[PDB]
Design a protein around this ligand. Structure first.
Ligand SMILES: [Cl-]
Ligand SMILES: [Cl-]
Ligand SMILES: [Zn+2]
Ligand SMILES: [Zn+2]
Ligand SMILES: [Zn+2]
Lengths: 222, 240, 201, 217
């Protein structure tokens, strides 16, 4: 079980720095090269550089030379990526991707495992946790739809799960919309059997990491 | 007598394997054992006759089958790093209480096959000071950086294998002893008379049979797939 | 349960290697001795079924059913006999095996001439090994203290047609510091070890 | 920088049909060590990218053998022998021979399926939200195809404009459908001046528009 676990999302002001971490598990950490790849919202992929945790050897994209710094701590199997003098177009999800080549092999040039990503928003606006409201199943409910409304948060993202991960089928978590207040809003829905409404408990698990919000909202028929 | 295949095997965690065992002695009782340092021989399963099988001390993750009297396969359902051991098959008449053992299967289970490396082999020619001082000539062979520890070193003089004047280390050195995935080094010596080394018609070859991956195994590294192969090094006699 | 004596037993060539073995089941009627060479399989060498002595070449097995005691003596020990000896016990036609006793028979070196030689790679002269050889069995080789210096334990070779036996240990390293003069520095070696000068360039 | 260009940038394909994505590089990609470090990754919606083919034509273990790669010089092709619904996402060719490593723009594979009309659902604002002073009314359009859909909000039969936002999911990996959520935002005071709340859905799968409505406020 190779796993790469990255640090949580953040908002940083323009001119500030961010240090994104990536903790490796399930393999000898110094044996593989760790790359950093970014993707701006709705955009393609951009390689930033890499560190070889064994010898501290680095390579970097000239486009970030002077702002990017890759380090590692072998005691805690973590690789860091610090990016300085944050500009508005540095808003992106940042991924750590493991090179395939073990023990100095050239296969390091292609990536096998990736972290989940760390969204960094470059903004002078303040962090705000969301409000979570039930989208109650209809009395006139066959299949019934229910969900949760995650209103007024900044910055992105929020994660939403159902029944702690035990409910995945028929789930639709929608892309957030930016409201005129400069705040985000999203809904998460699930279509379930109408017959289950009386018996089965439905709880949405919302997480907004920039504000440390963790809400477990029970969704019931009125 | 008791036959076993393969002699060596490297597996990836989760893989399946069947160690074959067969005898032509009409023995009713066949058994499987594993041998680990510190521990002695531990019985895994036994069969008191065709169609009958029973659990030994360590049945955990092993299945056995006795469809015929001659064969007794040991199936490894899903290989785990704890199953790394030497396995021996054994057969008793079951009627003389004497037990005979198969040659053994040395098995290594690794989390990743990218840790498998063939040896590099080098021959070191006799020192002139040794030749003059003792009238003897010692050739040294090194097999380095191999994983797993599944190798067979032999010396060949003039196209024929030799055993006289040979000493190969009984166990390899761990290159990084602290590590569990450590690569190995092994040395051997071949000592001949100074005059035998001095004849340029004599050719000495040090051969290392390495057991590694199959030609059907998957491989994503830039380096060559570390398959079962012979790696050798040679030296020619010299009237220097 | 089968229990054997503490190993490795160091036995000089020509001497008797004495192996003991005790068992707990009093109804045991079959007792055996297996010889296992390193990286090889256990081979049955002796079987004893009733009290007293059983000889077979250089081996003598002894059984004392009353004391639940099995013995194996290896007379006129040869370095050839260096192996692990396993004691196995049973009651009827399972076999309980002991952990074994490793026996190391040290060769009788009557004419030692201890020296450290430098041998070069037949393919590349910059690569070399240090061979500590022709020392008597009083000398023990210590393992490497440094992690990038490799040292093998003493090995006995037999030049059979000449009836000549000799000990040797190999040492090698990529370290710029490494030299034949310092290779075996962690071992207590003879004061008169010959250290020939290497070939200069 | 070596420029990697993909063609087409959007690829609609019916399951069972073959697909082909071209990758063109601004320079040759053979490294001094002899290897050509040209690869193909697929990023499915909401996930990290995943390696399919490494070094032009080598399939990564675990990838279905319906994916294959070929090419030399500056022209490289990724082929899918028979496309399956799970192949939906963006394909990227990559060059890691020379630093900086560079990716193509991405080619979005779209699965053509049969027309599927949306299942429409409406949700009134929760009483917990109403206490706060705002009213959100949600309309859900579940599992439809094609992606073209129109939602009109009606409050007491009056057509709304400027007080709603919508978002649509990516095409599903199993049924190849889209889902849309539309929120109508009103203040608690204006929400309480009206009885009928309705969202009206038009889509190709519907011969006549479908209305879902509720009374209260
Ligand atoms: Cl980007
Ligand atoms: Cl209502
Ligand atoms: Zn520069
Ligand atoms: Zn109005
Ligand atoms: Zn109004």
């Amino acid at each position: 079980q190779v796993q790469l676990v990255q640090s949580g999302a953040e908002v940083k002001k323009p001119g500030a720095s961010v240090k994104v971490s990536c903790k490796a598990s399930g393999y000898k950490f110094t044996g593989f090269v760790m790359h950093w790849v970014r993707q701006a919202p709705g955009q393609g992929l951009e390689w930033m550089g890499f560190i070889n945790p064994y010898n501290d050897d680095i390579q970097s994209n000239e486009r970030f030379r002077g702002r990017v710094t890759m380090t590692r701590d072998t005691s805690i199997s973590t690789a860091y990526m610090e990016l300085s003098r944050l500009r508005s177009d540095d808003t992106a999800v940042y991924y750590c991707a493991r090179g395939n080549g073990y023990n100095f092999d050239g296969a390091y040039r292609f990536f096998d495992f990736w972290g989940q990503g760390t969204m960094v928003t470059v903004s002078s606006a303040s962090t705000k946790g969301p409000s979570v409201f039930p989208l109650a199943p209809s009395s006139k409910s066959g299949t019934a739809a229910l969900g949760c409304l995650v209103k007024d948060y900044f910055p992105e993202p929020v994660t939403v799960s159902w029944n702690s991960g035990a409910l995945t089928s028929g789930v639709h978590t929608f892309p957030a919309v930016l409201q005129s207040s400069g705040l985000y809003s999203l809904s998460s829905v699930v279509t379930v059997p109408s017959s289950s409404l009386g018996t089965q408990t439905y709880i949405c698990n919302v997480n907004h990491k920039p504000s440390n919000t963790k809400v477990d909202k029970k969704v019931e028929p009125k | 007598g008791v036959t076993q295949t393969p002699k060596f095997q490297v597996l990836k965690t989760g893989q399946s394997m069947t160690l074959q065992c067969a005898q032509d002695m009409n023995h009713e009782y066949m058994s499987w054992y594993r041998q680990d340092p510190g521990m002695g021989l531990r019985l895994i399963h036994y069969s008191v006759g065709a169609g009958i099988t029973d659990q030994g001390e360590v049945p955990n993750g092993y299945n056995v089958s006795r469809s015929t009297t001659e064969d007794f396969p040991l199936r490894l359902l899903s290989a785990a790093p704890s199953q790394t051991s030497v396995y021996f098959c054994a057969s008793r008449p079951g009627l003389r209480p004497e037990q005979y053992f198969g040659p053994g299967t040395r098995l290594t289970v690794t989390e990743d096959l990218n840790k498998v490396f063939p040896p590099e082999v080098a021959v070191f020619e006799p020192s002139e000071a040794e030749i003059s001082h003792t009238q003897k000539a010692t050739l040294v062979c090194l097999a380095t950086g191999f994983y797993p520890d599944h190798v067979e070193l032999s010396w060949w003089v003039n196209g024929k294998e030799v055993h006289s004047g040979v000493c190969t280390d009984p166990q390899p050195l761990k290159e990084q002893p602290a590590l569990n995935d450590s690569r190995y080094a092994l040395s051997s010596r071949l000592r001949v008379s100074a005059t035998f080394w001095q004849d340029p018609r004599n050719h000495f070859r040090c051969q290392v049979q390495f057991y590694g991956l199959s030609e059907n195994d998957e491989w994503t590294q830039d380096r060559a797939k570390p398959v079962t192969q012979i790696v050798s090094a040679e030296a020619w006699g010299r009237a220097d | 349960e089968v229990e054997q004596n503490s190993g490795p037993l160091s036995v000089p060539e020509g001497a008797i290697a004495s192996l003991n073995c005790t068992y707990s089941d009093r109804g045991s009627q079959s007792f055996f001795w297996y010889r296992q060479y390193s990286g090889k399989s256990p081979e049955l060498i002796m079987s004893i079924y009733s009290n007293g002595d059983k000889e077979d070449g250089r081996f003598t097995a002894q059984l004392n059913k009353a004391s639940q005691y099995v013995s194996l003596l290896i007379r006129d020990s040869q370095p050839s006999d260096s192996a692990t000896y396993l004691c196995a016990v049973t009651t009827d036609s399972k076999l309980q095996f002991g952990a074994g006793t490793q026996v190391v028979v040290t060769p009788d070196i009557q004419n030692p001439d201890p020296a450290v030689y430098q041998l070069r790679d037949s393919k590349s002269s910059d690569k070399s090994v240090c061979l500590f050889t022709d020392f008597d069995s009083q000398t023990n080789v210590s393992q490497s203290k440094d992690s990038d210096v490799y040292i093998t334990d003493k090995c006995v070779l037999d030049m059979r047609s000449m009836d000549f036996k000799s000990n040797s240990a190999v040492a090698w390293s990529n370290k710029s510091d490494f030299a034949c003069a310092n290779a075996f520095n962690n071992s207590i070696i003879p004061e008169d070890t010959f250290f020939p000068s290497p070939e200069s360039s | 920088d070596i420029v990697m260009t993909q063609s087409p940038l959007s690829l609609p394909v019916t399951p069972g049909e073959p697909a082909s994505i071209s990758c063109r590089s601004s320079q040759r990609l053979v490294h001094s060590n002899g290897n050509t470090y040209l690869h193909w990754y697929l990023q499915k919606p909401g996930q990290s990218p995943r390696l399919l083919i490494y070094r032009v034509s080598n399939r990564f273990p675990g990838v279905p053998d319906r994916f294959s790669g070929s090419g030399s010089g500056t022209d490289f092709t990724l082929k899918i022998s028979r496309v399956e619904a799970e192949d939906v996402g963006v394909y990227y060719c990559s060059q890691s021979t020379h630093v900086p490593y560079t990716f193509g723009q991405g080619t979005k594979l779209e699965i053509k399926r049969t027309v599927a009309a949306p299942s429409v659902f409406i949700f009134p604002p929760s009483d917990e939200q109403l206490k706060s002073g705002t009213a959100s009314v949600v309309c859900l359009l579940n599992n439809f195809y094609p992606r073209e859909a129109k939602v009109q909000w009606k409050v007491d039969n009056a057509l709304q404009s400027g007080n709603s936002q919508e978002s649509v999911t990516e095409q599903d990996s199993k049924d190849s459908t889209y889902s849309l959520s539309s929120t109508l935002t009103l203040s608690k005071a204006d929400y309480e001046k009206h009885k009928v709340y309705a969202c009206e859905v038009t889509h190709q799968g519907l011969s006549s528009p479908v209305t879902k409505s509720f009374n209260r406020g």
